[PDB]
């Protein structure tokens, strides 16, 4: 009601002054006496509505959103279970434009001076909601693609990610195992969002667990094959990037991805894309085969000007593994 | 451009029929599809042949779907602020809110100066409880006669430690350097506290960014750690976590000669952490020798077993007291959890696997620890089972 009555112009200004002074007072309370914590009954009735709160802030109107956002910052700083991760998860999995998603970056920038570890809990919480029946697939897809934008924006390091300093990539990498089953998830948009996160989301710094490595490799080849069956050569780059990124991980991962890609290419499924017997257009077969063989050459070829016309050398061992699998 | 010139000289348009036109269009499309750098996509995109074959409406969909392959993203990182300064109170509050959102030390010094000028005697360190300081250092950090200096030192300390927490070590280094250069004038004890804090922050920074790929420290971090391990200064307040990370780093990079030989004698009597570092270093350097290794494996064995012992229903996990060890069980677990070195990790796993074999599990150098133990009743087998479970999970985290 107060925010509705800040947007008689004199009464509007009265409510505006009221809400500004109220925010000043709450901000004094939530952050002071640095002793049992103070109690703010006003904020203590808000934690049930923080998600609803987020919605108003995501409307990005002319002036209400600013007040609601400072309210979310204050509430998060106040609540002892540190509802900051919950607010961040709501902003991430609800934003639909880069400007709304800018609110989440603003919130974290306001938080990281008082709260810590909000990205792990926000994802550890967001992907936890994911492994359940909640968070209907459009919402999870929105979270995944907003995360993809976050990690991509951080990767192209300039001044923005240098100052925000989130580590979006790492804090999404430690959840690669939780992201992997989503590449089998039925609805296509969540699947591609997860795949496009994965293609750019760095693998864990130490290594990939053989269970993790093999589940990632199987999910990647399934995405690549399914990406192709539905999109064709244009829409597989995500998976391909991931697969290539998997195939340069280590000779175990290289041999696993080469063997699984060759076996999946030659299975009773993924065979009609390449002219396999049990009418289909030839053109699509040549160009599907183009994508598969280009992936194999990418995975097989040695990375790393060697003259302006030269070509990279195919490794012997990758072709040896393709040979034995054949 | 050789590809595209060959394509143009070989297509022979307005008489190539529909089949060749379609196939040439498909080839050009799909030679774009794999182009990793969009400027080359631009090459074929601008080419007249590209515009000529396909159509006047799929080229645009192609170029936009290749643009979204590597989209450029602009986002606001600056925090929201409802700044609009009528009253003294509203000015005070807005400026304190900025003080919250400010992380560069000079801006904080400016806002603290203006607030202390505008107010009479109110402190501004306490305008946020989310600002924390170690209790061993709070007493010294509140002894400065100047109120503004004390406030700035506190806020710099808190913001530097919280930045160290969120792995944004650039800001922490800046804030800490500002505090250190400000405190050199009046208080040597605070200067020493700052020196140790820079040492720990630099060690954390190296092991976070500068390491992670196997590169030697610049050898002055090692010298700084060495000097910190031999202070012999009683007046300076210390944090045991600084020494713990000093020993953890020192044992991370196999410099076992110093911990075995060059360590001062009084340090082993004083710090149990240095003693454990020496014991691991000695038992790791002597692995080649069947018999010389046992001389250090023996005291490593006894130190670890009485570490997991219970003096006097009583459980090590439930009580955490009544232990004969010089080092706490959870502190030992943490000190191990700062080790990522593979040889020391496998030595430690053999240590707790052999300890869990008495009352099997095989872990490499399992014949190096002695079998018969004293006071078998005093050790807590359930506590050792818990410790071995956590230890193996951490070891399968470092090197999965």
Swiss-Prot record, chain A:
Subcellular localization: Nucleus; Cytoplasm; Nucleus membrane
Transmembrane segments: 103-123
Domain of life: Eukaryota
Family statement drawn from the similarity comment of this UniProt entry: Belongs to the Integrator subunit 5 family.
Assembly information from the UniProt record: Component of the Integrator complex, composed of core subunits INTS1, INTS2, INTS3, INTS4, INTS5, INTS6, INTS7, INTS8, INTS9/RC74, INTS10, INTS11/CPSF3L, INTS12, INTS13, INTS14 and INTS15. The core complex associates with protein phosphatase 2A subunits PPP2CA and PPP2R1A, to form the Integrator-PP2A (INTAC) complex.
Function, in words: Component of the integrator complex, a multiprotein complex that terminates RNA polymerase II (Pol II) transcription in the promoter-proximal region of genes.
Protein name listed in UniProt: Integrator complex subunit 5
Native species: Homo sapiens (Human)
Gene name of this polypeptide: INTS5
From Swiss-Prot, chain B:
Subcellular localization(s) per the UniProt record: Nucleus; Chromosome
Residue windows of the TPR repeats: 153-186
Family assignment from sequence similarity: Belongs to the Integrator subunit 8 family.
Disease implication from the record: Neurodevelopmental disorder with cerebellar hypoplasia and spasticity: An autosomal recessive neurodevelopmental disorder characterized by global developmental delay, profound intellectual disability, seizures, absent speech, spasticity, facial and limb dysmorphism, and subtle structural brain abnormalities including cerebellar hypoplasia.
Entry's free-text remark on domains: The WFEF motif is required for the recruitment of protein phosphatase 2A (PP2A) to transcription pause-release checkpoint.
Function recorded in the entry: Component of the integrator complex, a multiprotein complex that terminates RNA polymerase II (Pol II) transcription in the promoter-proximal region of genes.
Subunit structure: Component of the Integrator complex, composed of core subunits INTS1, INTS2, INTS3, INTS4, INTS5, INTS6, INTS7, INTS8, INTS9/RC74, INTS10, INTS11/CPSF3L, INTS12, INTS13, INTS14 and INTS15. The core complex associates with protein phosphatase 2A subunits PPP2CA and PPP2R1A, to form the Integrator-PP2A (INTAC) complex.
Protein name: Integrator complex subunit 8
Organism: Homo sapiens (Human)
GN (gene name): INTS8
């Amino acid at each position: 009601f107060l925010v509705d009555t800040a947007m008689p112009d004199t009464v509007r200004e009265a409510c505006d002054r009221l809400i500004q002074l109220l925010l000043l007072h709450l901000q004094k309370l939530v952050h002071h006496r640095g002793p049992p914590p103070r109690l703010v009954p006003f904020l203590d009735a808000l934690k049930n509505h923080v998600g609803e709160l987020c919605g108003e802030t995501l409307r990005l109107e002319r002036k209400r959103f600013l007040w609601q956002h400072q309210l979310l910052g204050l509430l998060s700083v106040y609540t002892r279970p540190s509802c900051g991760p919950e607010a961040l998860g709501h902003l991430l999995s609800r934003a639909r434009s880069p400007e709304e998603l800018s609110l989440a970056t603003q919130l974290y920038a306001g938080l990281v001076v008082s709260l810590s570890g909000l990205l792990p809990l926000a994802f550890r919480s967001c992907l936890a909601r994911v492994h359940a029946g909640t968070l209907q697939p459009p919402f999870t897809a929105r979270f995944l693609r907003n995360l993809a934008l976050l990690v991509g924006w951080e990767q192209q390091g300039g001044e923005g990610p240098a100052a925000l300093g989130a580590h979006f990539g790492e804090s999404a990498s430690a959840h690669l195992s939780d992201l992997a089953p989503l590449l089998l998830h039925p609805e296509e948009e969540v699947a591609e969002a997860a795949a496009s996160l994965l293609a750019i989301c760095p693998f864990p710094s130490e290594a990939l667990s053989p269970s993790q490595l093999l589940g990632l490799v199987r999910a990647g080849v399934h995405r690549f094959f399914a990406s192709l069956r539905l999109h064709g050569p244009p829409g597989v780059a995500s998976a391909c990037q991931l697969l290539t990124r998997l195939s340069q991980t280590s000779p175990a991962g290289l041999k696993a991805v080469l063997q699984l890609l060759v076996e999946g290419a030659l299975h009773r499924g993924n065979t009609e894309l390449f002219g396999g017997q049990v009418s289909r257009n030839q053109q699509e077969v040549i160009y599907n085969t183009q994508s598969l063989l280009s992936l194999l050459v990418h995975c097989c070829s040695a990375p790393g000007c060697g003259e302006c016309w030269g070509a990279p050398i195919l490794s012997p061992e990758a072709a040896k593994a393709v040979a034995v699998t054949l | 451009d050789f590809l595209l010139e060959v394509c143009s000289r070989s297509v022979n348009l307005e008489k190539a029929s529909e089949s060749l036109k379609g196939n040439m269009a498909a080839f050009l499309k799909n030679v774009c599809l794999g182009l990793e750098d969009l400027q080359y996509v631009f090459m074929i995109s601008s080419h007249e042949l590209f515009i000529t074959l396909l159509k006047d409406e799929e080229r645009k969909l192609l170029v936009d779907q290749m643009r979204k392959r590597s989209p450029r993203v602009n986002l606001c990182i600056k925090p929201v602020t409802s700044f609009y300064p009528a009253s003294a109170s509203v000015n005070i509050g807005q400026l304190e809110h900025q003080l919250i959102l400010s992380v560069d030390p000079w801006r904080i010094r400016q806002i603290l100066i203006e607030l202390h000028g505008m107010t009479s005697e109110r402190q501004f360190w306490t305008v946020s409880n989310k600002w924390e300081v170690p209790s061993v250092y709070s007493g010294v950090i509140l002894g400065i006669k100047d109120n503004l200096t004390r406030d700035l030192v506190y806020i710099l300390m808190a913001k530097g430690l919280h930045c160290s927490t969120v792995k944004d070590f650039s800001h922490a280094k800046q804030l800490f350097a500002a505090c250190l250069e400000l405190v050199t004038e009046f208080s040597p004890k605070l200067r020493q506290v700052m020196l140790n804090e820079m040492l720990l922050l630099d060690i954390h920074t190296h092991e976070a960014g500068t390491g992670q790929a196997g590169e030697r420290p610049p050898s002055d971090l090692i010298s700084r750690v060495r000097g910190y391990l031999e202070m012999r200064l009683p007046d300076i307040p210390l944090r045991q976590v600084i020494a713990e990370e000093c020993v953890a780093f020192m044992l991370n990079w196999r410099e076992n000669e110093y911990l075995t030989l060059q360590v001062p004698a009084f340090l082993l009597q004083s710090n149990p952490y240095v003693k454990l570092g020496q014991l691991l270093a000695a038992t790791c350097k002597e692995l080649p020798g069947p018999k010389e290794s046992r001389r250090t494996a023996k005291d490593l064995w006894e130190v670890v077993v009485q570490i997991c012992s219970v003096s006097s229903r009583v459980s090590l996990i439930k009580q955490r007291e009544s232990t004969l060890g010089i080092m706490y069980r959870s502190e030992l677990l943490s000190f191990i959890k700062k080790l990522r070195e593979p040889l020391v990790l496998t030595i430690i796993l053999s240590l707790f696997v052999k300890l869990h074999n008495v009352r099997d599990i095989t872990a490499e150098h399992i014949s190096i620890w002695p079998s018969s133990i004293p006071n078998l009743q005093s050790v807590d087998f359930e506590a050792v089972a818990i410790t071995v479970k956590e230890l193996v999970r951490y070891t399968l985290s470092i090197n999965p």
